[PDB]
Each structure stands twice: as C-alpha cells, then as structure tokens.
RNA sequence: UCCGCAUAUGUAUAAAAAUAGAGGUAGGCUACUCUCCUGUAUCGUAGAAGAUGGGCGAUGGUUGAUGAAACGGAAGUGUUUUAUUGACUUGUCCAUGAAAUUCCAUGUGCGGAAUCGAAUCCAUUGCAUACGACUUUA
RNA sequence: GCGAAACCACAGCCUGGGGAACGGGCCAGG
RNA sequence: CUGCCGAAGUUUCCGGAUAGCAGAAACUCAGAUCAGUUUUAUGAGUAUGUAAAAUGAGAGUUUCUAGUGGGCCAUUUUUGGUAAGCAGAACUGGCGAUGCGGGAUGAACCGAACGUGAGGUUAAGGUGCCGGAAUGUACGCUCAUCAGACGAAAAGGUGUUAGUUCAUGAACUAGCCCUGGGCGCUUAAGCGUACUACCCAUACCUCACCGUCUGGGUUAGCUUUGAGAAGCUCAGACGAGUAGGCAGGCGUGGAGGUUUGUGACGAAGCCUUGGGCGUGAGCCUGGGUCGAACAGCCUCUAGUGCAGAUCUUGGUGGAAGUAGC
RNA sequence: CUCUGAACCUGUGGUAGGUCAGCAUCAGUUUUCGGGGGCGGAAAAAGAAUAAGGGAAGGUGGCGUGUUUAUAGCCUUGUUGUAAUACGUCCACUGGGGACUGAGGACUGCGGCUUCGUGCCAAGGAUGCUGACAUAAUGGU
C-alpha cells in the first residue's frame, strides 16, 4: 500500500521463504527494511528435515549459523546480487536477533502473507529458526532468550502507562458534549 | 461451468428404414458443440450408429427445478484408465445436478488423474431417502445436528500493523 | 508542514521488459494507494514527474525535473505504464515519483 | 483540467454580472514599445503595467456581492481561506470531493 | 511446419497468413476438405452481425488484382454490377444468404486480414475445440471469436 | 513535412574498434560463420534500405534547407529563385576575399549561408 | 591555529500472546462481562508556506531558547521530568494586506605554512633474519 | 655498468550443466 | 557499397550425357486451361482408380544457361531381430541458405519464419523473489528425516486417500508418500481439474516511411503552372538468404572537353570530444597545422579500392632492464 | 500629372518566426468502465404466493418412543395475478476516461443538413485558441 523510509518487521511467526520474498521485493522497490526477532522465524517441516538440509549445507563457503545470517542468506538468493542494483538493495536490509534498543521503541509491523498461522495448515510440524540454529553452532540462544523477558517487562510496563494515560482522554472524550453533538459524520 | 443437455438423435432415413428410432441421452458439456460430439461418440460405441448416417433431432439445456433445496446425488460412472475398465459410484450432496457432476470431475481428476474424454457417466440419480444413502460422509451431513466451526478461515496492504485475530 | 503535497507518491519499479529484453521508452510505476487495475483507471493521463537535484546551479536552481504522463495500467496489482519526455535513467529503479491530480476529470 | 470541482454547497453568484469577463478582459497587453534608440540603451525605459484601479474596483464589487452569500452558510468563509492538501493515507481515487 | 497437403488446401482457401479469414460455401466438397486442415483452421456459422461488421470494418475488394477497400458503393457496383450487386448491403445479402452468385461475391472479397483476439485464445490453442482447444469446428462460437479479432 | 531521421548513429564496421588497422568505414561481412552477417541478437546493425529517409525530406539540413556548394558570386546568384529551399555553402578552398563577396551577395538575395563566418573578422 | 583558492514534502504512531483464541474485566485468587472480526484507525492538518492587528474564551495547549535532574546497556544516544524565559496560540469572533506570476511549466571543501603531540627510521638490538618486515632498549 | 632471443587473437578465481571441445569466453551458483 | 532474383544439395543410365530445380529470350493464349486439394457416383481391388463438380490461380509452351550430383536430426510405417538395447529398408519433413519468443543455459523440442519505426493484440511459455505478469478464485491428493516440481522398481508398507465387488468384514480398483536454474516452497511457490484476470516475439492488426515489383494516368504541353516524357503523378502488394545470376551507384591514377572553376587574402596533404548530408560505399564543411598547386561535371582510359596469403619492405611494442656478461 | 511602400519627419497606426508546453473541437487506430431497449430458453428454471396430500434431520404438542401443524413448519402436487431475474443474442441506442498517429496539401468525389443557398457539416488524412525564450529554451557529441 504505502511505504515508509524504514520498516521494522517483527519476524515472530513468519515463514522464512514467504517473508524473505516479500522483503526482497521491498528492498528492490527502494525501501530500507529492518527485521527484528529473526530467531523466531518458522520453517515448514519437522526438526530433522531442515536439520539434514543444513547438515548437507555444512558439507559444502562460509557457514553462518546466526538466525539473521540464515535470513540474510535467504533474502540474498532472491536478489540480483551479481549487479550493482542487487548489492545496493541488499545493504538496505538489517536483520538481527531480538529487538535492539534502537528498535524496541519503534513500531513493528507484520506481513500477513508470511504469517505461519495464515499460511500453514493446522497440525503441521514446523521448525523455528532460533531452535534450529541453537544445535548447529549458535551459542547465544540462552542469553537472548533470557533478555527478551527484560524487554517484554519494560515494554509491558510502557503499555500499561500508555493505557492508563489514554484512559483520561478517553473519559474526557465522551465528557465533552461536542463529541456527540457533531458525531453525525461518523467520527 | 458445465451445462446439462438432453440430446435426441436418429439415423438418416433410408429405403430400409422409412422411420428410425429416436435415441435420447442426458449428458453434460460446457457448450452444445461438445454435447453433440459426446452424444455421437456414445452412440457409436453403444449402438454402433455412425455420425455420417445420423443426425441430431433435438437438443435442450436443462435447468435444475429446485436449485434452492439441498439434495444428494448418486453418480454411476465408467473409468477408462491404464487398464481401461472400471465401474465406480459416488455420492455428492449439493443443490444442482451440474454441481455434483463438476464435483465428481474435480474429485476423479485429482485423485485418479483422469480426463473428461475418458470419464463417461452411465446415470445420475437423486437419493431421496436417508436409508438409501450409502457413504458415511453424506450420512453425517444429514444428521439432525450439523455443528462445526468455520473451516479454512484464513482471515494488497502488506505490512499489517497488528497481529491478525484469525478467530471469533 | 502538512499543507502541501497536492501530488501522490509513486515509485519507479522498472521499464517494460520481457525476461531478457528491456524497453526503456515505457516505465512501470507503482502508485501508492492504487491496489488494482480498476483503481489505476483514475490516474490514467495524469502528469507524473521525476524530481532530482544536480551539482550545477543551472537556471539559478539546484533541482531539475523530468515530466511524463500515465498511459495505461500494468498487470493486476495497480502498477501503471508511464512515458516520460526523456526516458528515465536505469539508476532510478526504486526512486520516487510524484503523480499530480491534473489533468483532472474530477 | 487544472481544477477539482468540490461538492461543497454552492455560492450565490447569479447576482454579480459577469459579462465584463471575456478573453480580451484577461488578455495580456500587446507589445507596442514606443522608445528611441537612446534609452533602450542604458535601459532608461522602466516600463511597468501595474494593475489599474478599475481592476481593483471590479474585484471590490465582486467581493461585496459575494461575501454575504458565503457568510450566510456556516463554516464556509474560512473554508475558502484554507488551502487543500493531501495527508498520510489519503487516496484521491477513493476520496470524494 | 505445415505438410504440403495442408499447404495446398489453405492456398486454395486463400489462407496464406495466420488470423486470415474467408467466407466459404458449406457443401460436401468443402466439408471433407476442411477435415484435412482441421488442426490448422477454426470455422463456424456466422450470424448477420459477424457478416455485416466484417464487410464494413475489414471489407476490401479485388479490383484489378488490388486490395481496394469498399468505402463506396460504386466500387462494388463496378465489379459486381453484372450480378446485380450494387451496394455493401447487396454484398452482405449475397454472402449471408448464399445467393446464386455467391462464388463471385466471395471471390471479390479479399481474405479478411484479422487481428489477434482481444483476450487471447484458450490456454492451449492447437487442440481441437471439443477438447478445450481453439482448432476445428465451433459452430456459433465463431462469432464470439470474430468480435475479438474485429 | 518536418525533417525525420530514421537513425542518427553511423554504421561502424564490425571489429573496427578492436583493430586499428581496420577502419570504421562500413564493409559488408562475408564470413558465413560470422554472427553479424547472420544478424544474431545483440550484434551491430547493418545498412538496409528500410533505414532510408523520406524522399521529400532527403538531403535536408535540420533547418529544412539543402546545402548547395558555392565557389563564387555566380553560384550564389543561382539561388535567387530557391532561397526557401537551398542554403549556400562556400567551398573550403575559396579565399577570404571571395568569401566576403559571396556573403554580401547572399545577404541581398535572402540566401542562408551555412559557413558565413569562416576566415573573416568583424569590425563595426 | 593562520594564509591563499573554490563555493523529504506529516521524514507522526513501541506490550506480549495464541487460534485445540487471547487481551483486559468488577470484586476479593477469581467470577462473569466487554473488545477484536486489522491502520478506511489514532495523533496532527486554516492563516499573503501560513501576515499584521483588535481581541475574546481558557487564563493553556503547542513549541524555540537556555539552566537542568531522573530513566534508558543489546548496539542505552533516546524516553520523560521540568524550572523558566518568549512566541504561535486556529479555541473562538471581527477588521486590514494578498493581485499585471492577469490559463500549466520549478559556513563547507582543497593547497600551503608557523605549532603541538605521537610513531617509524634512528643509538640501536637479535628476540627477528633473501630483502622486506618484526621485538627490545638511546 | 652493458644487455638479449624465442613466444604473443585477446582477457584470465572455482563447482556443475551447455548434447558438436563447449571453456577461458555461455547459463546457474560459490 | 546498396538493391533485386535465387537453388540444388538426386531420379535414370553412367568421369559425363542427362533429367530436374532457378533465370533470359521467341512465342500463343482467357469463347483456356492448370493444380503435393477435396469431390459425385461406379470400375476394379474403408483405401485405390476413373471421367465430368467444388475451390484457387490466367496458363501452356519452344530454344539455351549458371550452380548442385552429399549428409545430419530424426519422426512414422517397417524387416530382421538379440540376453536386451539394436541394426536394415522405404516414407515423412525439418536443419542444411534462417535470424526471432520460449525451453534455467542449449544446433536441431514448443511457437513463429525477418525492410525502418509508433501504437495495439497475441502464440509457445508463464505471473512467490531473482523476472515483465493474480502470494488469483473453486474443488481434491500428499507431508516425503533422499518429497514433489525433472533398474536397485519386484515387492514391502501396524503408510494412506477415495471408490468397486462379495458382503460382520474380506479383498479388489485407481492415485498420492516412504524403503527398495537458484533462493526457497508444503490446506504450495508441488501434482490434477475447472474458471476468470494478467505478462510479451522480428508473429497478427492499424498508421507512417524506405525500396522492389505490378497496374493506371499524363501534349493543339489549358495561368495549377506538377513536359530533365530519361519528367510528373495515382494505386495495390511484397521485403530471410549460401552458391549463382542481374541492375544501380561510391572512390583512385592519367586523358579529351567543360566550369569566362578554386588558390600566397593560402592549393594539396595531415590533425580535430566542431557541424552537417547519404541506407551505405562516401561526400561537404568549421578550427588547427601547412606552404604550391588543385577540383566539380560529360566522356575516355587503367599497374584503380585489402585485415588476413606461417604475404613483401620498413617502423615499433610486451617479454624486460628479464636470460645473462 | 503619374510613378518610385524612394530619404527623413510624422504614426506610439495595424499585422508581426523558430524551438518547447497547455487546452479545446475533430479524423484514424485502440484500450477501459457505465446507462438503457428489444428478442430468445421449460415464452428460463426458481421464488413471493393460491392451495391438497405426505413424511421426518419429529419441529411443536402428546407419551428418548411414536406423531402429522398443534403453540414451528418441511417437501410434493396441482395451483394465485402475472411475473421478475440470470444467461445467450442483437440495437444503423447512448454516456464518460486514457493512450499513439495528423500522412496529404487550390478546386473537384460520395454523402448529410439546407425552401434554395459563391450556404453549412464530424462527408476523398488537424485545425483552432493560448503561454514560455535569445545573455534561454531545445537537441547533438
């Protein structure tokens, strides 16, 4: 629909291929894309399925394990990286594990065309990228899975403060008669 | 979409046959040209009546008399496969005879990887009795208490701001 | 500063092309907010511009513009075909274009 | 072609005579240029054609006959004073004027 | 990739180009002639509108072995006046009703050089019309095809 | 009938840029295996008669006039009846004395001169 | 530090969580109700690119400028709290000015010096060693 | 200090495939 | 240099006479014939053949006159086969003289055959991203830990989905899964079917222009003046091309004529990211350099045009300041 | 007397040429939405609706069992004034939006208006109304 200068995507529950194709098309469209929570991506198939896929990849190159490096590789294969246009589009992508401080205070959007709950049939086994990465070499799973609660607790406290603050204007809305005097316009 | 045509045909009269017999079949085709060709092919392989010596005397599309009433249709079909000889019978619950035949074609072309030319319908009947229903799936659909949640909900404007509710 | 921008934002996606042949004379433009080929009928014939800046202060100004018009929709998703007075440079893929509201039939 | 006809309530304009507004009324003054080849050099001409008084008189007459019409209907005087613009999320193909 | 047997028949129908069209009197000598070139042509029954609009928009006549458009009734009269055809409507009437001088009226008309259909053909074009293609006899469905090529 | 050019680039001989011994004057390739003669994709174009320009606008300069070569005052006076169709072009080997005489004569005849400023100075 | 030279268009939107659903819910762990069913929403949006005044309502919302204290570690680099000092205050009502644009075209960098440190060569050394280059000490 | 000659279509990182070597030169990748 | 025409690539006897294919000339001829075509019916054996209907095209010639006298991809029919493949005939067309869209890429697979362009529309293929185009609609199969998208194969499946038969079950049938281009995809971005949208070829349509061919008009040369009749004008169609054939042009040295031609106020040559003309060979010109001759047109003439010849002569490179002295 | 647009004063009279851009009336080609109107089909089938009968996915009553409109109704059948709608097809019926093109160059022609018209017209190919610039605009290398 509409574009922003920087789009932050919360990759929790997003399929790897579906999100990467959407992100790659947005990168080539002239947009700066930041994907957070790259360790919460999902891949269709059981744990052993993509395990052998990655183990075969290890047999083949600079083997990267971090979840963002997995996602960065998936996006790169969907770009014309052999040309200057593809390389320039790649540099506009920032994939990270977790939500760093510059991004945890910014709004994060989701891609419905890539969400697992709207694309995978219920009862289908799936493999999370973060869990899959943890046994193939990634060693920062525990510390990032511990820090998220600290971010969630701080963010939850912020939402409660914002919700409590909003209650005042919400009550003051219906308090003002002009809200309903000219509410015939649908507002 | 498919259309049900009733086609009546007969051989060209000759000195041996002053007046020939009339042969009528109810067959499904997207257009009248397909129905006439299928009718001649059925006559050629059932009555050994050549198209050159025969002519179509009538053709009329038939609409479903009660398209707003749920019905159960049993279809007897003949499958031409690698073996080339199969007899099958299926039951579909829908509102029109056309829909059941379309559903049958979709089912067999999917499961059995068949084609329109190979599949030939001997008969389509309407099962008006619950006891006459044979398939367990259709019997469930006729139970007094159909009660199930909405299936396969799945519901440009990319980059939605909030998580989908995808529920009640 | 929200008392301006009589135009609509747009992006220069590519030229008209087959798999291996490009046609730079006509460009594919994605007007934002237009999400189907029926909504692309509103923007047909509208003036579109590419606005960029160059080092030289020629004309006593730092900004230069390439004008164009929207000819027809492209595809099903609301992209349009635009012909510019000068063919848009290939470096402007993913750049921003402005779709005015004139010539208006509204 | 360079104008959007909004659906705002119409103003009463039948009162003001508009027969004086023709293409010659708005036409730019034709070039006569009475000079000599002594002041064209040195640029000693300073030719200016600032708007004459009758144009302001016509504008005042139109304003006087129009202001009560826009004053009677509410929320219209400053509506004409405001400047139209597009904000975030505005889709002109969907918005109606 | 056309067999010489089919090439000869199409040259007899004046179908030298793809999308070209002609009016043909339907008889036994033609019925089995079209059977040979069935994979390479499509044909059917034209209604009045198809005949009427073809002669108007795409109507050209062979005058001194030249493709002269039928923009005036004097063009038709100067070539088919001996058969009492004096206008486009007389030419349409001779073609649509297959009059006594149909062959002269039909041979006067240049083969209709039609355009590609607006909307395309079906997904597979060279299958027979019965099997979901676009080749062979299609009866009243030729009109719907002509409305795209006109 | 404004002047239209079907093509403005020249036709350069194949491999003329690779080799200095090979000039850029067009030569029709004769090799059967050469892709330029076979007219493959991406290869350079070849002079065809379809590239020929309109007969009415042929030989016409961008201002609509045809260049007429002039060597003396007799040649300029020839364009008295064709000053709207032809422009005078003084030859390169005409001296600066004759060039002056040609230019004054062409001015009275209303004849455009393509190179009226060559080999001369001005003094007002 | 001196000298010379060249001179984006509203950039507005922060819980988490699953669909075999959650969020929050009085009350005192609940109970049950409510909400969704996307942001087509919310925040902002007048002013000759946004003037001059008279003001009025509220005696206050935005902010600039400084003085600030707290919070923010994951890459805190920003979230507030303000103390004031000035303004616009679209909250609202008036009076002036807009035009002949009389139909679209829209300090920063280099090259020099006088300086302050540091490093290498250097007194060096074999610790290193085809040479490079390396390590110590004047 | 003095001082050659042979040679020279042209560039030159690998894995696969391009059927007639395809390779170094194409295609898909690292 | 451009334009136009354009093969054969093989029957028969036997290096050729041929024939045949492709052109030139000399003809006659629509009240006439011709055909990689279909017919009518009966003749003979659905095929085959027949004389005289449909459709298209105006046709028949006589003479001589260049080039070729192979194969490959194979399909199909087909003979022998032989572990099995495979081989042998004919047939069929294509490539061979043919570029273009697709097929991930591709000498033979699917589309389509080509003057220069604008616009439109398609074919074959496709529309998750790379990549132009629906992360379209509807109905089904499958979760593959070696999915699928492109013989170890017999079977095994306490792997299934649907149905048929007999009838509580039993088996059977058919199809998916396992064992035996990239990124990625899984109620798919796989497979099957149906349905609308969309993408684009040198293809199709409309228009402009180039050229070729064909047909027509044009003199008491009318104040429409547009008679270089070798001119002017109107119309329609067409455009691959090896060998080969035929036209028209560009350029060079010298000769006869001509321009009452150019030139020390600068000829010729040379240089130049100056400008222009021609489809092209080429030509004109500005500036710079330069210093004595030179050109256009008509005709004549020839030691007349170069990228190749392990070409000739001369000059100069990388190797290389290397091997070395 | 005529002529020399003859020189200058007088006019400050009147018209003013090459690249770009905008719009409007058109013609050619084309694409894309919409409004109506005929004619076909089982003169659509349905349905609303007049109505007789029946059964149960037995409703409602009666006693989960059986019921027959109860205090729901369902289906079938003829049937209530006719239809409507969808689909197919046609209009020499009609209203908008977009894009590319402007070849030709006195007059002829075929047509339509017009009482007739040196008449007018969308009828053998684009014109009209404007705006911007020479120290710039526009293109080329």
Asked if residues A140 and A67 have their Cβ atoms less than 8 Å apart, the reply is no
Of B165, B154, B156, B163, the closest CA to residue A37 belongs to B163
Determine how many CB atoms are found less than 10 A away from the CB of residue C90: 12
Residue A2 sits at the chain C interface (C-beta within 8 Å):
yes
Task: Give the full edge-to-edge strand order of the sheet including A32-36.
Answer: A6-10, A32-36, A93-95
Rounded (to 5) percent helix, strand, coil in chain B:
20, 30, 50
Nearest CB among A111, A117, A118 relative to B158 is that of A111
Which residue in the block uniquely carries the two structure tokens 């299609």?
A: E138
The Cα–Cα gap between A145 and A132 comes to: 14
- As a rounded value in angstroms, the CA-to-C1' distance for A172 and J1 is 107
Distance from the Cα of A27 to chain B's closest Cα (Å) equals: 14
Residue E116 approaches strand J within 7 Å at CB: no
Asked if residues F21 and F7 have their Cβ atoms less than 8 Å apart, the reply is no
Q: Are residues A89 and A128 in the same domain?
A: yes
Sequence-distant (6+) residues with CB within 8 A of F77 are: F105, F109
C-beta atoms of B33 and E129 within 8 A: yes
Distance of CA A145 to the CA centre of its chain: 16
The Cα–Cα gap between F109 and F75 comes to: 12
- Provide, as residue numbers in chain B, all residues whose Cβ is less than 8 Å from the Cβ of C35: 156-157
Output the CA torsion sign for E119, E125, E127, E128: positive
> Three-state SS for B161?
coil
Q: Strand G positions with any atom < 7 Å from protein CB?
A: 7-21, 36-50, 72-79, 90, 93-94, 98-106
Asked if residues F100 and F120 have their Cβ atoms less than 8 Å apart, the reply is yes
D89 half-sphere exposure, CB direction, 13 A CA radius: 1
| Phi and psi based region of residue C23 (left: phi greater than 0; alpha: psi -120 to 50; beta: remaining) | beta
The Cα–Cα gap between D86 and D93 comes to: 12
- As a rounded value in angstroms, the CA-to-C1' distance for F28 and I310 is 28
Sequence-distant (6+) residues with CB within 8 A of F11 are: F26, F44, F45, F46, F47
Which sequence spans correspond to the domains of chain E? 1-150
Using alpha carbons only, what angle is made at residue B152 by residues B149 and B153, rounded to the nearest 5 degrees?
Answer: 80
The 8-class DSSP code of residue E72 comes to S
Q: DSSP letters of chain C? A: --S---SEEEEEEEEEE-SS-EEEEEEEEEETT--STTGGGTSTT-EEEEEEE-SS-GGG-SEEEEEEEEEEEETTTTEEEEEESSPPPGGGTT-EEEE-S-S---
Structure tokens at F121: 């100075």
What is the domain range of residue A186?
142-187
Q: Are residues A162 and A94 in the same domain?
A: no
Asked if residues F61 and F40 have their Cβ atoms less than 8 Å apart, the reply is no
Q: Are residues A117 and A159 in the same domain?
A: no
The Cα–Cα gap between A16 and A129 comes to: 8
Question: Terminal CA-to-CA distance of chain C, rounded, Å?
Answer: 26
Give strand letter and number of the nucleotide nearest A77 (CA to C1'): I183
- As a rounded value in angstroms, the CA-to-C1' distance for B60 and J44 is 12
Domain end residue (candidates: A107, A126, A141) = A141
**Separation in Å, CA C94 to CA A26, B53, C43, C88:** 9, 68, 20, 12
The 8-class DSSP code of residue E29 comes to H
Distance from the Cα of B81 to chain E's closest Cα (Å) equals: 18
C-beta atoms of D1 and C8 within 8 A: no
Query: Is the previous residue joined to C103 through a cis bond, with omega within 30 degrees of 0?
Result: yes
Nearest CB among A22, A107, A118 relative to B166 is that of A118
- As a rounded value in angstroms, the CA-to-C1' distance for E65 and I33 is 20
The Cα–Cα gap between E41 and E138 comes to: 11
Instruction: Give the residues across from A86 on adjacent strands.
Output: none
Which residue in the block uniquely carries the two structure tokens 């009427």?
A: E52
**Interrupted backbone of chain B, residues before each interruption (C–N > 2.5 Å):** 155
Q: Do chains B and A touch (3 or more CB pairs under 8 A)?
A: yes
Angle between helices E48-57 and E88-97 in degrees, nearest 10: 140
Residue D3 sits at the chain C interface (C-beta within 8 Å):
yes
Length of chain D: 97
Residue D81 sits at the chain C interface (C-beta within 8 Å):
no
D36 half-sphere exposure, CB direction, 13 A CA radius: 2
Which chains does chain D touch, 3 or more C-beta pairs < 8 A? C
C-beta atoms of B33 and E139 within 8 A: yes
- As a rounded value in angstroms, the CA-to-C1' distance for F37 and H29 is 34
- As a rounded value in angstroms, the CA-to-C1' distance for A164 and G136 is 68
Residue A63 has phi, psi (to 5 degrees) of: -75, 115
Residue C35 sits at the chain B interface (C-beta within 8 Å):
yes
Which residue in the block uniquely carries the two structure tokens 């209709």?
A: E112
D92 half-sphere exposure, CB direction, 13 A CA radius: 26
- Provide, as residue numbers in chain C, all residues whose Cβ is less than 8 Å from the Cβ of D2: 102-104
Rg of chain E in Å (alpha carbons): 16
Resolution of this entry in Å? 3.0
Nearest CB among C3, C4, C104 relative to D3 is that of C104
- As a rounded value in angstroms, the CA-to-C1' distance for B82 and I197 is 36
Asked if residues F4 and F52 have their Cβ atoms less than 8 Å apart, the reply is no
The Cα–Cα gap between E12 and F63 comes to: 54
Residue A85 sits at the chain C interface (C-beta within 8 Å):
yes
Strands C63-74, C8-17: pairing kind: unpaired
Determine how many CB atoms are found less than 10 A away from the CB of residue F50: 7
**Separation in Å, CA A76 to CA A28, A90, A91, A160, D4:** 11, 7, 10, 40, 46
| Phi and psi based region of residue F55 (left: phi greater than 0; alpha: psi -120 to 50; beta: remaining) | alpha
C-beta atoms of C77 and B157 within 8 A: no
By CA distance, what is B117's nearest residue in E?
A: E131
| H or E element at residue F57 | none
- Total domains, chain F: 1
Which sequence spans correspond to the domains of chain C? 1-106
Q: DSSP letters of D39-92? A: TTGGG------PPPHHHHHHHHHHHHHHHHHHHHSTT-HHHHHS-----TT--T
Q: Are residues A166 and A136 in the same domain?
A: no
The Cα–Cα gap between A6 and A35 comes to: 10
Output the CA torsion sign for F21, F25, F29, F34: positive
**Longest CA pairwise span in chain C (Å):** 45
Distance of CA B25 to the CA centre of its chain: 13
Which sequence spans correspond to the domains of chain B? 1-67, 68-144
Output the CA torsion sign for A171, A173, A176, A182: negative
Rounded (to 5) percent helix, strand, coil in chain A:
55, 15, 30
Asked if residues E20 and E113 have their Cβ atoms less than 8 Å apart, the reply is yes
Of D4, E97, A70, the closest CA to residue C105 belongs to D4
Of B69, B66, B72, B68, the closest CA to residue B141 belongs to B72
Residue A118 sits at the chain B interface (C-beta within 8 Å):
yes
C-beta atoms of D4 and C2 within 8 A: no
Residue B28 has phi, psi (to 5 degrees) of: -105, 135
Sequence-distant (6+) residues with CB within 8 A of F27 are: F13, F14
The Cα–Cα gap between E50 and E82 comes to: 26
Nearest CB among A3, A85, A89 relative to C32 is that of A3
The Cα–Cα gap between A37 and A155 comes to: 15
Which chains does chain A touch, 3 or more C-beta pairs < 8 A? B, C
Distance of CA D62 to the CA centre of its chain: 11
> Three-state SS for E129?
coil
Give strand letter and number of the nucleotide nearest A62 (CA to C1'): H30
């Amino acid at each position: 629909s509409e574009f922003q200068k920087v789009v932050v995507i919360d990759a929790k529950g997003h399929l790897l291929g579906r999100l990467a194709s959407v992100v790659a098309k947005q990168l080539l469209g002239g947009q700066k894309v930041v994907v957070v929570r790259c360790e919460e991506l999902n891949i269709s198939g059981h744990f052993f399925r993509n395990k052998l896929k990655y183990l075969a990849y290890l047999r083949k190159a600079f083997h990267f394990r971090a979840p963002s490096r997995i996602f960065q590789k998936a996006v790169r294969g969907m770009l014309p990286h052999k040309t200057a246009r593809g390389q320039a589009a790649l540099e506009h992508l920032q994939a990270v594990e977790g939500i760093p401080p510059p991004f945890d205070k910014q709004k994060r959007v989701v891609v419905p065309a890539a969400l697992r709950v709207l694309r995978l049939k219920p009862g289908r086994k799936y493999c999370t990228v973060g869990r899959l990465s943890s046994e193939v070499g990634w060693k920062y799973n525990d510390i990032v899975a511990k820090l998220e609660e600290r971010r969630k607790v701080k963010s939850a406290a912020f939402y409660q403060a914002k919700l409590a603050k909003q209650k005042k204007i919400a009550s003051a809305k219906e308090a003002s008669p002009v809200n309903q005097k000219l509410s015939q316009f649908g507002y | 979409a498919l259309k049900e045509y009733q086609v009546v045909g007969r051989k060209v009269p000759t000195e041996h046959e002053p007046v020939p017999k009339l042969f009528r079949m109810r067959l499904f085709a997207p257009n009248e040209s397909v129905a006439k060709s299928r009718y001649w092919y059925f006559l050629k392989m059932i009555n050994k009546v050549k198209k050159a010596t025969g002519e179509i005397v009538a053709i009329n599309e038939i609409s479903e008399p009660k398209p707003l009433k749920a019905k159960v249709f049993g279809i007897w079909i003949r499958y031409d496969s690698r073996s080339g000889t199969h007899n099958m019978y299926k039951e579909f619950r829908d509102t029109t005879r056309v829909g059941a035949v379309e559903a049958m074609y979709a089912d067999m072309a999917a499961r059995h990887r068949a084609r329109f030319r190979s599949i030939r319908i001997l008969k389509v009947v309407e099962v008006e009795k619950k006891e006459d229903v044979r398939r367990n799936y259709v019997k469930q659909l006729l139970n007094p208490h159909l009660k199930f949640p909405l299936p396969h909900r799945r519901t440009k404007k990319v980059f939605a701001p909030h998580r989908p509710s995808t529920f009640y | 500063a929200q008392g301006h921008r009589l135009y609509v934002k747009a992006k220069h996606l590519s030229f008209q092309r087959s798999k291996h042949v490009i046609h730079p004379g006509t460009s594919i433009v994605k007007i934002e907010g237009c999400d189907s080929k029926e909504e692309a009928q509103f923007y047909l014939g509208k003036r579109v511009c590419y606005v960029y800046k160059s080092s030289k202060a020629v004309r006593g100004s730092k900004i230069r513009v390439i004008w164009g018009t929207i000819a027809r929709p492209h595809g099903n998703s609301g992209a349009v075909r635009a012909r510019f007075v000068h063919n848009l440079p290939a470096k402007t893929f993913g750049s921003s274009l402005r779709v005015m509201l004139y010539p208006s039939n509204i | 072609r360079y104008v959007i006809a909004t659906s705002a309530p119409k103003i009463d304009v039948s009162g003001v005579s508009v027969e004086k507004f023709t293409k010659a009324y708005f036409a730019k003054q034709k070039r006569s240029g009475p000079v000599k080849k002594d002041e064209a050099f040195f640029a000693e001409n300073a030719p200016k054609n600032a708007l004459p008084a009758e144009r302001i008189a016509d504008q005042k007459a139109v304003d006087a006959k129009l202001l009560p019409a826009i004053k009677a209907i509410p929320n219209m005087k400053e509506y004409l004073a405001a400047s139209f613009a597009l904000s975030n999320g505005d889709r002109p193909h969907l918005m109606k004027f | 990739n056309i067999p010489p047997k089919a090439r000869k028949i199409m040259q007899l129908l004046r179908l030298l180009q793809i999308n070209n069209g002609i009016f043909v009197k339907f008889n036994k000598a033609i019925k089995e002639m079209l059977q040979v070139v069935e994979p390479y042509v499509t044909y059917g029954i034209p209604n009045h509108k198809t005949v009427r609009e073809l002669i108007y928009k795409r109507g050209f006549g062979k005058v001194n072995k030249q493709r002269i458009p039928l923009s005036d009734n004097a063009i038709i009269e100067a070539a088919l006046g001996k058969y009492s055809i004096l206008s486009v409507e007389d030419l349409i009437h001779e073609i649509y009703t297959v009059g006594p001088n149909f062959k002269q009226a039909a041979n006067f008309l240049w083969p209709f050089k039609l355009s590609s259909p607006l909307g395309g053909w079906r997904e597979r074009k060279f299958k027979h019309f019965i099997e979901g293609g676009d080749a062979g006899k299609r009866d009243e469905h030729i009109n719907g095809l002509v409305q795209k090529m006109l | 009938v404004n002047i239209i050019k079907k093509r403005t680039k020249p036709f350069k001989r194949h491999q003329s840029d690779r080799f200095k011994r090979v000039g850029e004057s067009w030569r029709k390739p004769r090799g059967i295996d050469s892709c330029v003669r076979r007219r493959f994709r991406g290869t350079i174009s070849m002079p065809k008669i379809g590239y020929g320009n309109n007969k009415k606008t042929r030989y016409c300069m961008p201002n609509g006039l045809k260049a007429f070569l002039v060597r003396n005052v007799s040649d300029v006076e020839l364009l008295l009846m064709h000053n709207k169709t032809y422009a005078a072009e003084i030859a390169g080997n005409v001296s600066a004395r004759k060039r002056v005489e040609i230019v004054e004569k062409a001015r009275a005849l209303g004849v455009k001169v393509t190179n009226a400023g060559a080999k001369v100075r001005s003094q007002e």
